[PDB]
Amino acid sequence: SERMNWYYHVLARRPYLVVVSIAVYCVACIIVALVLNKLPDFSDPTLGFETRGTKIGERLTAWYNLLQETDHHGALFSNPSDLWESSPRKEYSHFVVQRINATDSLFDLNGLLAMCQLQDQITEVPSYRAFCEPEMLTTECCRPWSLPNYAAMLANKSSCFDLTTEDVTSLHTLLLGCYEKRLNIVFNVLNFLTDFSFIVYLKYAMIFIPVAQSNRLLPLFHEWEDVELINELVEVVAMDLGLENELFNELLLTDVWLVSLGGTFVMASVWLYTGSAFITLMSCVAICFSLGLAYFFYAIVLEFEFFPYMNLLAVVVIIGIGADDVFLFLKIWHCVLTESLENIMALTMRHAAASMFVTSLTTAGAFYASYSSSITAIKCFGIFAGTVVVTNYLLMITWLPASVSIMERLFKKSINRFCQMFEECITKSIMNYAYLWLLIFGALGASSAVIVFWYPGLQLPEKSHFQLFVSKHPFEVYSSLKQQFWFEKPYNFKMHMHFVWGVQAVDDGDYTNPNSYGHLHYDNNFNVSSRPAQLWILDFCQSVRQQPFYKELPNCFIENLIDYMKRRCIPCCDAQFPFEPHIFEYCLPQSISNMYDTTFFRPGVAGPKFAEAFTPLLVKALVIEFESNVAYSTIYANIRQFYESVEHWFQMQLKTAPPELQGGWFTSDLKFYNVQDTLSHDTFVAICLAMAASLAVLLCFTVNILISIYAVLTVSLSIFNTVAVLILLGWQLNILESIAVSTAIGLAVDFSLHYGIHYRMSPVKERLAATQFVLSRIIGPTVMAATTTGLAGGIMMASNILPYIQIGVFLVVVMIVSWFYATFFLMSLLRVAGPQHGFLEL
Ligand SMILES: CC(C)CCC[C@@H](C)[C@H]1CC[C@H]2[C@@H]3CC=C4C[C@@H](OC(=O)CCC(=O)O)CC[C@]4(C)[C@H]3CC[C@]12C
Ligand SMILES: CC(C)CCC[C@@H](C)[C@H]1CC[C@H]2[C@@H]3CC=C4C[C@@H](OC(=O)CCC(=O)O)CC[C@]4(C)[C@H]3CC[C@]12C
Ligand SMILES: CC(C)CCC[C@@H](C)[C@H]1CC[C@H]2[C@@H]3CC=C4C[C@@H](OC(=O)CCC(=O)O)CC[C@]4(C)[C@H]3CC[C@]12C
Ligand SMILES: CC(C)CCC[C@@H](C)[C@H]1CC[C@H]2[C@@H]3CC=C4C[C@@H](OC(=O)CCC(=O)O)CC[C@]4(C)[C@H]3CC[C@]12C
Ligand SMILES: CC(C)CCC[C@@H](C)[C@H]1CC[C@H]2[C@@H]3CC=C4C[C@@H](OC(=O)CCC(=O)O)CC[C@]4(C)[C@H]3CC[C@]12C
Ligand SMILES: CC(C)CCC[C@@H](C)[C@H]1CC[C@H]2[C@@H]3CC=C4C[C@@H](OC(=O)CCC(=O)O)CC[C@]4(C)[C@H]3CC[C@]12C
Ligand SMILES: CC(C)CCC[C@@H](C)[C@H]1CC[C@H]2[C@@H]3CC=C4C[C@@H](OC(=O)CCC(=O)O)CC[C@]4(C)[C@H]3CC[C@]12C
Ligand SMILES: CC(C)CCC[C@@H](C)[C@H]1CC[C@H]2[C@@H]3CC=C4C[C@@H](OC(=O)CCC(=O)O)CC[C@]4(C)[C@H]3CC[C@]12C
Ligand SMILES: CC(C)CCC[C@@H](C)[C@H]1CC[C@H]2[C@@H]3CC=C4C[C@@H](OC(=O)CCC(=O)O)CC[C@]4(C)[C@H]3CC[C@]12C
Ligand SMILES: *[C@@H]1O[C@H](CO)[C@@H](O[C@@H]2O[C@H](CO)[C@@H](O)[C@H](O)[C@H]2NC(C)=O)[C@H](O)[C@H]1NC(C)=O
Ligand SMILES: *[C@@H]1O[C@H](CO)[C@@H](O)[C@H](O)[C@H]1NC(C)=O
């Protein structure tokens, strides 16, 4: 312990040196990272929710690169000839309206005058005059066509002068007369405006303005948010615009300013606890420098080219965690002052470094275990947050004690009395009433296990939408109110299976960014023209005709080629189905040419693919399409059954094939299903890794076995109760939720670690004295840490984005649950049956 004495002497005797050096280095790294790496573009929020590296992901990447290589460039070419030498539509912007006093049908006069007022309110907005999409060049901003407008249109007069009880009732008699006289397009248009349940009492109406859906009309959206259109009787409840991602970005960038408020509150907490402004200032600086160093190591050093939006969530975490190691430090420091600076620094560092290290290690280990996932955004988030935590810990060790020593170089009643009363009440409660808390929190643990595991588990998302905004946001309300209207159904597109042979199922790209798919490799053992290959391809088609999932051209080209052979002469003419391979390769491109030269020209993925090696071409690949009876569903079990069945049958069929064609693989629109499977598997893996990290850290630092078991129990019950609370709040499995379930461990184990470490650290080995010592020393820092984290999240609750709200719920829930379990369940366990006299000590 001689070298560490020198480090403590440096921190105590020359702190300005460490401060200046850290500041210079971190500011330089920030300068480099922000100047050299161009800034993150969140133009598309659903970027990196794909599972690169898996079987399905490999196949999908290969299939994508194939289409990327079909026609625009590359030796491949589908056709060898290319190788040789007014009424509305959905794209307009539309508002969905409902009536909210009487709450009767919208249709009658009062609703129509309300919609007149709505239209006059919308069109009075200034920017609308620029976006109006004027037509006819008559110096007119064209009017929005809706219910009252059409009611006036059937009449000769204009709108808002309806005289409805004779006029609107005539419009009613018109609609009841006809169903699907067709004056201009009134019936068809108006039956597309209103909902299914119009035949009387349309639950919802819709207003169409002459404005295309674009990314440009965001100030229009904000101007409409100013005047909320709720005037007396009607409510604009779902305004669809092609504006989800732009508003998502803008709201992220505003809600980080809102994160600044939680940062301010955490700084206020540090000021109240410590009693100086210098330490809170330098802790803010430490949080910022940790973020900067992490962004530098992420972008510049590690060359991670993709920065998700989820990485910003790490900021919301670290403002909670970064100040925590402050509260633990100065406490011990003040204790050492009660019982020059070099010795004090040595003692408080020997007492605090274990706990600080342990907390940051558990959090960073969970975050880095998130890198085990196949999804890319999870990998990026894991690496970023782990780097942020590790930077925060190094910043703690170096920059915090120097700031402490500088504070002492620089150098309340109600606060002390309140903290004393709080400590006294908590201590007396735990010591007197222990079995009560043990029973209560064990019951809650069992209930939460039943909730999280058996019946209402973390069910997968089945109507995904990759939701972004709050449920009571118009862009998200509209997605629920789509199906009620007519022009939202295309009936359903059946799924179409592809079988590909020429190319390998490999992803030779960087799995971290979604814009490096790599280069496809062609299988060189691939020979279609062989006679056994012809026989097997024919039997394959005719076998697909047998199987149940089949549903009924370019696909199964071999049939069209046999037809091209069947035609009598007057080379390719007057042949049979089994014929010579050079005749095959010479006549097949001619068959495709004559089939495309037909005026049908069915453009599809199906067919063979040729390359230059008339000149003799060679087939590098083919894809065989078949329409399947299964419809495109979002749920997991249907596509699981479909994919498993078809893959099993195909892999059984391939064994019949020669070794030439034994390189084929299956594909469909299996992106979301692949995500769904990998998400559960990777969540389990990340939970296992983080749990192992926490268990190891426990066994090393709180060397006793019983304390480790009690801590594992407390953490497991805390995570159970948290996940259960989230489920009852309406949480389903998703990327953020898998992340949060993996990181709840490393967030929650901190409190248990503090208590177990200080319990081992007690001089008196009796459980009673050890518990008193533990509580008296460490009750305050845990409280202020949990408070800072929960407060940082609970301000994010006041946001319109779902990620930030979800983090608010998660941080608040985890911190409160973990504190109440570790403080009452674990300490009661130690008070009643804790280890004394070194029982079960390593
Ligand atoms: C930049 C990041 C990696 C954080 C680490 C900070 C280092 C740059 C600090 C930590 C220990 C510091 C050293 C601790 C003490 C000394 C002894 C000192 O020697 C003297 O005796 C001059 C003063 C005198 O004699 O009064 C020269 C600087 C040096 C090596 C300091 C140089 C800078 C060091 C390596
Ligand atoms: C330590 C924690 C609190 C993270 C805070 C990081 C800040 C340095 C970032 C967060 C949001 C950023 C702002 C988000 C967007 C803009 C608009 C930008 O001007 C533009 O018109 C182009 C960008 C756009 O319009 O999206 C000028 C800087 C500014 C205010 C950025 C300034 C720096 C801010 C405050
Ligand atoms: C001050 C210390 C704690 C450093 C903290 C890092 C932040 C200053 C960085 C991290 C990610 C950066 C963002 C990643 C990039 C964007 C998008 C950009 O908006 C645009 O759409 C313009 C670019 C384009 O459209 O081409 C506005 C800045 C912003 C939010 C950057 C603002 C500053 C952020 C929050
Ligand atoms: C430094 C502190 C925070 C402790 C944590 C160390 C991490 C850097 C370790 C812990 C678990 C390690 C992971 C455990 C296993 C895997 C899977 C591996 O991918 C594979 O698919 C091949 C191995 C397999 O069969 O799983 C990639 C590395 C990775 C994530 C390891 C990367 C580094 C991790 C995140
Ligand atoms: C939220 C649920 C899961 C339990 C945790 C909430 C605590 C703030 C409560 C629970 C029981 C409360 C205790 C129940 C009764 C008393 C006796 C009381 O004794 C007195 O000296 C004055 C009043 C009296 O008891 O006569 C001191 C506070 C205390 C231990 C209370 C302190 C705060 C406790 C630990
Ligand atoms: C072991 C089991 C019984 C877990 C017990 C934990 C309780 C403290 C949780 C379980 C369900 C939670 C409730 C679930 C949902 C809500 C609604 C919430 O108000 C809202 O309007 C927002 C809800 C949303 O939008 O999802 C107020 C809190 C409350 C009652 C929560 C309060 C705390 C409750 C009772
Ligand atoms: C202490 C030992 C004896 C274990 C006791 C376990 C009970 C506390 C479990 C068993 C059946 C459970 C219930 C089974 C299922 C439901 C439905 C559930 O309703 C919902 O719709 C919430 C889901 C959502 O909104 O996402 C509310 C919880 C509840 C009654 C569970 C509450 C807790 C119960 C009573
Ligand atoms: C004891 C420690 C762990 C702190 C946790 C206390 C919670 C009960 C507090 C913390 C912040 C509070 C939140 C801060 C502000 C808001 C916004 C409020 O709704 C608004 O949108 C009004 C503000 C706006 O204009 O956006 C709903 C309650 C809520 C989430 C509060 C609910 C309760 C929260 C989560
Ligand atoms: C170990 C035992 C004592 C568990 C107790 C934990 C509570 C402090 C947690 C459980 C559920 C939490 C609540 C879950 C969510 C809500 C709703 C939130 O307001 C919202 O509108 C969010 C809903 C949305 O925007 O979608 C205000 C905070 C609150 C009551 C949270 C406050 C703190 C609660 C009551
Ligand atoms: C696929 O395999 C067949 C036989 O295994 C190859 O056919 C022969 O080689 C040349 C090709 O022009 C010709 O002599 C005959 O067509 C075949 N040889 C015989 C019958 O002895 C065929 O070339 C292979 N495909 C490719 C693209 O090379
Ligand atoms: C105007 O009124 C006449 C007489 O009822 C009717 O035939 C005509 O269709 C009306 N005009 C419009 C645009 O509906």
DSSP symbols for 678-711:
HHHHHHHHHHHHHHHHHHHHHHHHS--HHHHHHH
DSSP state of 514: T
449: helix, strand or coil: helix
Q: Using the structure block, give the residue that is written with the tokens 């480099």.
A: 32
The atom number, within ligand 10, closest to the CA of 583 reads 16
CA distances from 243 to 193, 221, 488, 598 (A): 21, 9, 18, 43
Ligand 4 midpoint to CA 734 (Å): 21
Q: Would residue 466 be called left, alpha or beta, if left means φ above 0 and alpha means ψ between -120 and 50 degrees? A: left
**Helix, strand, coil proportions of the chain in percent (round to 5)?**
60, 5, 30
Q: Is 446 in the pocket of ligand 6 (CB under 6 A)?
A: no
Distance CA 616, CA 180 (A): 56
619: helix, strand or coil: strand
Angle between helices 636-654 and 671-701 (to 10 degrees): 100
Q: Which helix (H) or strand (E) holds 95?
A: strand 92-99
Q: Which helix (H) or strand (E) holds 207?
A: strand 205-212
Q: In the structure encoding, which two tokens stand for residue 709, read together?
A: 């078991």
477 phi, psi to nearest 5 deg: -65, -40
Tell me the three-class secondary structure of 773-818, residue by residue. Answer: HHHHHHHHHHHHHHHHHHHHHHHHCCCCEHHHHHHHHHHHHHHHHH
Q: Using the structure block, give the residue that is written with the tokens 């620094």.
A: 345
Q: Using the structure block, give the residue that is written with the tokens 């999932």.
A: 549
| Of 645, 634, 724, 646, residue with least CA distance to 675 | 634
Q: Which amino acid residue places its CA nearest to atom 15 of ligand 3? A: 40
| Of 785, 3, 17, 787, residue with least CA distance to 401 | 17
Answer yes or no: are the C-beta atoms of 278 and 407 closer than 8 Å: yes
Distance CA 383, CA 392 (A): 14
Torsion over CA of 27, 32, 33 and 36, rounded to 10 degrees?
160
Ligand showing the shortest atom-to-Cα distance for residue 257: 2
Instruction: Identify residue 259 by its one-letter amino acid code.
Output: V
Torsion over CA of 723, 724, 730 and 731, rounded to 10 degrees?
20
Q: Which helix (H) or strand (E) holds 236?
A: strand 234-240
User: In 71-98, where does DSSP find H-type helix?
Assistant: 80-83
The atom number, within ligand 2, closest to the CA of 254 reads 11
Distance CA 480, CA 498 (A): 32
Q: Which amino acid residue places its CA nearest to atom 22 of ligand 6? A: 729
CB neighbours of 453 closer than 8 A, spacing ≥ 6? Answer: none
Answer yes or no: are the C-beta atoms of 423 and 776 closer than 8 Å: yes
Q: Which amino acid residue places its CA nearest to atom 21 of ligand 8? A: 798
Angle between helices 164-177 and 147-154 (to 10 degrees): 90
| 208, β-bridge pairs | 94, 145
Answer yes or no: are the C-beta atoms of 52 and 509 closer than 8 Å: yes
Distance CA 668, CA 59 (A): 9
Ligand 10 midpoint to CA 698 (Å): 68
The atom number, within ligand 7, closest to the CA of 727 reads 26
Cβ count near 410 (within 10 Å):
9
Mutate to test the pocket of ligand 4, among 302, 360, 361, 368 (most ligand atoms within 8 A of CB): 368
Q: Is 816 in the pocket of ligand 9 (CB under 6 A)?
A: yes
Q: What's the sign of the alpha-carbon dihedral 755, 761, 762, 764?
A: positive
CB neighbours of 501 closer than 8 A, spacing ≥ 6? Answer: 523, 526, 528, 621, 622, 661, 663, 664, 665
| Of 733, 743, 834, 167, residue with least CA distance to 438 | 834
Ligand showing the shortest atom-to-Cα distance for residue 442: 7
Length reported for the chain: 842
Cβ count near 170 (within 10 Å):
13
Q: Would residue 79 be called left, alpha or beta, if left means φ above 0 and alpha means ψ between -120 and 50 degrees? A: beta
Distance CA 703, CA 579 (A): 78
Q: Is 786 in the pocket of ligand 8 (CB under 6 A)?
A: yes
Q: Which amino acid residue places its CA nearest to atom 13 of ligand 2? A: 253
Buried b (16+ CB within 10 A) or exposed e, 281-314: ebbbbbbbbbbbbbbbbbbeeeebebbbbbbbbb
- Going by their DSSP bridges, the two strands 618-631 and 665-667 should be labelled as unpaired
Q: Using the structure block, give the residue that is written with the tokens 């300013």.
A: 257
618 phi, psi to nearest 5 deg: -140, 145
Distance CA 755, CA 782 (A): 9
DSSP state of 667: E
43: helix, strand or coil: coil
Q: In the structure encoding, which two tokens stand for residue 602, read together?
A: 């069915």
574 phi, psi to nearest 5 deg: 65, 35
Ligand 7 midpoint to CA 463 (Å): 24
Distance CA 728, CA 715 (A): 20
CB-based pocket (< 6 A), ligand 4: 361, 364-365, 368-369, 371-372, 689, 693
235 phi, psi to nearest 5 deg: -140, 120
731 phi, psi to nearest 5 deg: -95, 135
Ligand 7 midpoint to CA 723 (Å): 13
Q: In the structure encoding, which two tokens stand for residue 620, read together?
A: 């590098």
Ligand 7 midpoint to CA 710 (Å): 26
Answer yes or no: are the C-beta atoms of 142 and 210 closer than 8 Å: yes
Answer yes or no: are the C-beta atoms of 799 and 793 closer than 8 Å: no
Q: Using the structure block, give the residue that is written with the tokens 């893959």.
A: 647
Which domains are delineated in the chain? 3-36+247-411+418-457+675-833 (1.20.1640.10), 92-242 (no CATH), 494-508+518-669 (no CATH)
173: helix, strand or coil: helix
| Of 125, 141, 92, 42, residue with least CA distance to 242 | 92
| Of 721, 688, 770, residue with least CA distance to 447 | 721
User: In 48-126, where does DSSP find H-type helix?
Assistant: 55-70, 80-83, 109-123
648: helix, strand or coil: helix
Instruction: Identify residue 786 by its one-letter amino acid code.
Output: A
After which residue numbers is the chain interrupted with C–N beyond 2.5 angstroms? 85, 100, 180, 199, 339, 411, 490, 552, 570, 613
Q: In the structure encoding, which two tokens stand for residue 154, read together?
A: 């059937």
| Of 112, 209, 200, 202, residue with least CA distance to 161 | 112
Buried b (16+ CB within 10 A) or exposed e, 720-729: bbbbbbbbee
Distance CA 255, CA 39 (A): 18
Task: Tell me which method was used to determine the 3D structure.
Answer: cryo-EM
By CB atoms closer than 10 A (0-12, 13-18, 19+), residue 179 is exposed
Distance CA 366, CA 294 (A): 16
Mutate to test the pocket of ligand 10, among 530, 536, 617 (most ligand atoms within 8 A of CB): 530
In angstroms and rounded to an integer, the radius of gyration of the C-alpha atoms of the chain is 34
Ligand showing the shortest atom-to-Cα distance for residue 446: 7
Q: In the structure encoding, which two tokens stand for residue 519, read together?
A: 């280069």
| Of 345, 326, 328, 321, residue with least CA distance to 280 | 326
Mutate to test the pocket of ligand 7, among 447, 471, 717, 720 (most ligand atoms within 8 A of CB): 447
**Strand order through the sheet with 205-212:** 205-212, 92-99, 234-240
Distance CA 63, CA 623 (A): 10
Q: Which amino acid residue places its CA nearest to atom 11 of ligand 2? A: 253
Answer yes or no: are the C-beta atoms of 397 and 325 closer than 8 Å: no
Q: Which helix (H) or strand (E) holds 205?
A: strand 205-212
Distance CA 451, CA 461 (A): 18
Answer yes or no: are the C-beta atoms of 386 and 686 closer than 8 Å: no
Q: Which amino acid residue places its CA nearest to atom 3 of ligand 1? A: 22
Ligand 4 midpoint to CA 815 (Å): 27
Reported structure resolution in angstroms: 3.2
Cβ count near 46 (within 10 Å):
13
CA distances from 650 to 551, 634, 653, 667 (A): 17, 24, 5, 11
Q: How many Å from the N-terminal Cα to the C-terminal Cα in the chain?
A: 22
| Of 182, 175, 180, 181, residue with least CA distance to 147 | 175
502: helix, strand or coil: coil
Ligand 5 midpoint to CA 146 (Å): 63
The distance between the two most distant Cα atoms of the chain, rounded to a whole number of Å, is 112
Q: In the structure encoding, which two tokens stand for residue 446, read together?
A: 């069992």
| 375, β-bridge pairs | 51
Ligand 4 midpoint to CA 388 (Å): 18
By CB atoms closer than 10 A (0-12, 13-18, 19+), residue 670 is buried
| Of 710, 841, 836, residue with least CA distance to 767 | 836
610: helix, strand or coil: strand
Answer yes or no: are the C-beta atoms of 283 and 392 closer than 8 Å: no
CB neighbours of 78 closer than 8 A, spacing ≥ 6? Answer: 70, 71, 592, 607, 609
